[PDB]
Structure formats: C-alpha cells, structure tokens
Design a protein around this nucleic acid. Sequence first.
RNA 1: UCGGAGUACAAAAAACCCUCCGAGUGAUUUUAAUCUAGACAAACCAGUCAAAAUAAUCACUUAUUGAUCCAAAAU
Lengths: 95, 48, 151, 288, 54
Amino acid sequence: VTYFSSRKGKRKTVKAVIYRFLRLHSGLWLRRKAGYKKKLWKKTAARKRRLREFVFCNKTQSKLLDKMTTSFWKRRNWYADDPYQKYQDRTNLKV
Amino acid sequence: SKTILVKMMSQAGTGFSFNTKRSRLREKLTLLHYDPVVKKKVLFVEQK
Amino acid sequence: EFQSIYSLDKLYPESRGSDTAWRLPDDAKQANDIPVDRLTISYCRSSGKVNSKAEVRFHLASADWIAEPVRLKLAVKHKNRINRSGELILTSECSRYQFRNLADCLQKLRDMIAEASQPXXXXXXXXXXLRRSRIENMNRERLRKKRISSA
Amino acid sequence: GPRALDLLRALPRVSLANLKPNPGSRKPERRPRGRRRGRKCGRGHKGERQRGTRPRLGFEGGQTPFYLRIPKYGFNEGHSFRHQYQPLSLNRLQYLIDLGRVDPTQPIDLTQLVNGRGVTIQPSKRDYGVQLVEEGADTFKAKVNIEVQMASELAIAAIEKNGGVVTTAFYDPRSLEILCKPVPFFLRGQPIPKRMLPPEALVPYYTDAKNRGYLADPARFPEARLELARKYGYVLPDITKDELFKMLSTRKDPRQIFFGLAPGWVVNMADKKILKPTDENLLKYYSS
Amino acid sequence: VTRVFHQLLDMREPVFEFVRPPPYHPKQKRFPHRQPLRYLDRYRDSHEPTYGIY
RNA sequence: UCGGAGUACAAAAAACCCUCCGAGUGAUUUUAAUCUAGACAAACCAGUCAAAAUAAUCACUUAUUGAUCCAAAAU
Ligand SMILES: [Mg+2]
Ligand SMILES: [Mg+2]
Ligand SMILES: [Mg+2]
Ligand SMILES: [Mg+2]
Ligand SMILES: [Mg+2]
Ligand SMILES: [Mg+2]
Ligand SMILES: [Mg+2]
Ligand SMILES: [Mg+2]
C-alpha cells in the first residue's frame, strides 16, 4: 500500500486486488476459488463444481482488502445489464 | 508405462470432454457420454 | 424553428406532422379481446413478503365477447375454478406491482380463450402423475365389474 | 419560545471568557509520557514492531499472500467503459411533481430533474443519464412529458395510463455534461456544439418504437404504444384531443441539446443576448 | 361433488391444498464465509429490485 | 510434502534426528451429468459429504500429489 502518493499526496490503490476481486456495496467481497482452471481431468465432478463457483470472503479478508482499495471502488454503481446488481444490498439481516 | 491425455470430440457441435488414456491401450477410446447443447447421450470420439 | 440534417422529418419523410405519431389506429385492432370494462378486477394488497393478489372475475354465461363453442368449452376444462354464481375466477400472485399481475391474469385469460378456441387442442395426458389414477381406476373397475341389478 | 432564553436574563454575559464545547466533542489526545503511557509507549517489546518497520499490508510473512493466491478474473474488467444509468423511481418522480419541484406543465428532460435536485449526474464517472424504474407504478397519478436515456416497460406503461408521453433520448459524455450543469457551460463561453449520435451497439435500442426511441420511426409510435395498453389492460387516452397537447408533442432534434436553441449558437448572459452565425460554412457545420 | 354444495347445502365449495413447511435456513451471517454467491438469494424477501430512495 | 497403525487405552486434537508400515500409481468398463437445500472440516488457501430438482470398481483404499503469474493451445 502507498499511503501517500508522491505527486498527488493521495492514497494509492493496489491493482492486483482489483484484477481478481469484486466489491459489492454491502461490503461483501467476491472471488474466484483457486485452481479452477487447473488439472481438470484429475478431479472429481464434485470438486469441479465446488471450484467453478464464486465465493465470499470473511471479515478479516474483506477489511484487509478495503485497506488496499481506495474510495473509488467503494462507490455505488448502476451498470446497465449488471449480472450482480441484483446482489448488492443486504436483506433481512438482523444482528 | 505412461498416462496420456486425449481430447474427446462430440458428434454434434463444439461440445468437448477431456480425459486420460492408458499407454498400453487395453480399451481404446470411444465413449457414450453427455452432450450439453442438444441434451443427449452420444458417442464421443477420441481426438487431439 | 430548428432542423438539422439528422432530424426525424429528414430521416423519415413519409410521416411528418407533430400529431402523426399520436394517431390512434382503432381500425388496426378491431377485435378487443377481453373488454376490461366488463370485468370485475379486484386487488388484494398484502404487505409484510410484499405481494398483491390480482383477481379477475366475469360471468361465463353472460359474456358475449366469446362465442358459444368457446363459452361452453371453458366451463369444461376450467370447471374447478368456476363459482356457484357462474363467475370464472383467475388469480395471479408474484409481482409486488399489481400491473404485472393484471398482465398475468389477462394473459392466463388470453391463454385459456386461445386454447379453448383451438378445436385442435387434444388435451395430451401425461402418464407420470396419472399412472396411479389409471391403475386405481382399473383396480376399482375389476370389483365394479360384478353384475347384479340393484334397487 | 425557548424558555432557555429567559434563563439568560439570570446569568452573566456570554463572552469569550466563558465557553465550553459540547461534552464529548473533544476526545482528548494522550501523550506517551509518565508511568502509564511512557516506556515502550504501546509499541511492544523489541521485535519488528518496536522498531517501526513491520512489512507491507498484503503480506503474510512470505506464505503466498492471500490476495495473491487467487486467480485473476474478468470482474472489474473494462469497468471504465461499461455505461451507467442513474436510476429514477416513479415514486421519486411523483414526489417531485407533488412538492412542485419539477412542474409537469412545461416539458421535462434531465436538466429539470437536476434543478429540482431530484437526481445527480456525474458524467465524468461514465454516467450516460437517468433511467426509469417502476417502483411507484400503482402510486403514479401524474400526467407528464418525460425524456430519459433509458426506461423499462412497466414505467412506460405507468406514464401512458395517465396520458403522458415518454421519449427515450440519448446523450454523449460531453453533451450530457452540457445538459446537467448548463449555466456553467455558458459561462465557459464556447459555442453550443453538435450532439453526438449514439454508438453502434446502442443504435438498435434507440431505433425501436419498442422503447419509443428518439431516433425511431414515428410511424410505429401509435402502434407499439397502443400495444402497451392491451398487454397491461387499460383504455389508452387520446392525447391529440388534450389542451396540453402541444407541449407533449414537443421534441428535440437528435442534434439539439436544449429546448429552443440550436447548434452553433453562443449565449452572452451579461447582455442577455443570443448570438447566431451568419457565416455559411459554420451553419453547414452545426446544422448537419 | 361440486353439484352437492351448490344444490344441496346452499354452501360455497371448500377447496384445500397441501402445504409443506418453508425450508430451514440458518441465521444469516454478516460475512458468509466460503459461500456460494447464490447464498444471498436464500434470504431474499421477495424478488424485485427495490430502490429505496432512488 | 502425502497416508496407515502405535506413541494418543473410551468425542475430537496433540510433539519428538520417536517406533513401524506405505505413496509420487496401476487394473477396468459400467465412462462414473447438469443444478442446488443442509452440513463436516478448517487461521487462511485448499479440502470433504450431500436430500429434493432436471436429464464407478479392485489392489489394507486411506496416499497416489502442487497456488498465483506466465506460457502454449481452441471454443
Ligand atoms: Mg502431460
Ligand atoms: Mg507501560
Ligand atoms: Mg528495549
Ligand atoms: Mg521478540
Ligand atoms: Mg452516482
Ligand atoms: Mg485411540
Ligand atoms: Mg466445526
Ligand atoms: Mg437424487
């Protein structure tokens, strides 16, 4: 992380976070499951399912990720057609 | 002896299966398998 | 009074006037299936899962907009949902906006009138859910088969 | 009013001499002095942390870093060029006409929605305009002329039922900017440029009477529109017969940014004067 | 039987259904860990985009 | 690095330059599919079961295996 830029004085973002994750607006971070393109024939159909999935990151991971991520990826987004727009809010959450 | 990887091709369309063949060739590779597009049981042929 | 080379007149020269797109071609559609001024359309708005029941009601015998073959064949297949007062009741549930429930019901209606106005409907019966019904029909038929004139 | 007032007759002057900020406003800083907070000052003992060098944030102590084990993926892929459309619910719209922020009488495009502070567009952020949703569908009683960049079927329906006319019009990044905060564009003092045509992929969306696209053939407008009623089951009103008809009819060129103005013009707001070119090449440019 | 209630008892016709209990889902977690995306739709109230202030 | 037994006598866990056995794959035919409740396990990563919904066995069987990135391939 670069907490202060050279030229702008701002807080830089990591790109290699962004290339592999996705942030919902709820704060849930979404990721691929590792090795899913890897040695398929050697694997049981069950595993193959479990891998082709998209999954969620626990609080620790999320917070961590936020720190490496600026405001701009935390903003609200309305994309046309967005597969994931359905998902962004939290429902019925009683804590 | 060895473990070969061969790419099995469907009759209809671009649907593919991917699996290993034995180097001694006890039973050579042709299958009756599942093709996704037409939802059918077909003969997958051994290819590369 | 601006115009550009790309304007709606210069692209589409045939139709021009400001009142052209506002014509209402009542002659284009003369059939008017399901005359909504003759339906009792009731809404049950349930808020809590949020869903608005849409209910469509009209008299089967008193409805002229469908012909007598169509009017009598609807009392055949759909006889389960019909009412003691002659009303045919259609129900939709899903969408919280009652508009899509209107469209749902009017479409279940369009469907029913379409299928019943098709004499080509053969009413194909699946054997998967009805195998029990056929086999219990025949097995109560072997005992029904006892013949003695009674009463 | 506030009987607190009459308590101030009793008391001495309010002056600088007596001032307390609200309790708990200043949560006091502490400084690593003294027996408690001195001596290692909450930095721990030796090791790395006490010396201030502990490694960077993504780091696991060399085990392949969490964020780095996971494979890359198209996710945020081309995120910059994916168009966005700021949503506008019908409920919010009914609201805004109700409190008379945006008035239905004169035509309504984006600009007006903006000035009522009912919507906020940040064109620089790839916002291509306002789009419509069906939320207040049943709520909606208003007769309105609306021009948006995108709309959904149910929305179009709920305006039709009440007898307003919806048009789907497009704006490019630049023109959209000019649209949203127009006064500061004038104070820029540059001519008022031509409007872009929508990109190629978008073309089919705007050529359909299906969407009542501003670039679509008006010959299908009365058709598909009437169709909308049979699907949703209501009597379609006769708009041509209405008093407010000539406003509802009001359109733009596909080349026009505003209502009543034309490409090439220049506004001097000091002299309250409009300026138009009398040169030919210019007129051929901006009128094409 | 439909003839009965109409003709005989001056009664409306009761129709019934069979209702199996709605499936059991665990107390929703603020951070579902290692869970399929569709986890979210499990606790979905009803299906509709709901734009609160927009 | 991976797995079986003891050490660890009865849910789990549990070290040692501790004690003893193994694995870095064969053999076939029956090619072992999509999709999803609920779970085990677990610092993370990986690992396991699995109803309803639509159309793999035998060798103690448990081990037979490597993440990103990067390359080559086509759908
Ligand atoms: Mg190889
Ligand atoms: Mg101390
Ligand atoms: Mg010291
Ligand atoms: Mg130390
Ligand atoms: Mg915004
Ligand atoms: Mg024991
Ligand atoms: Mg546990
Ligand atoms: Mg099953």
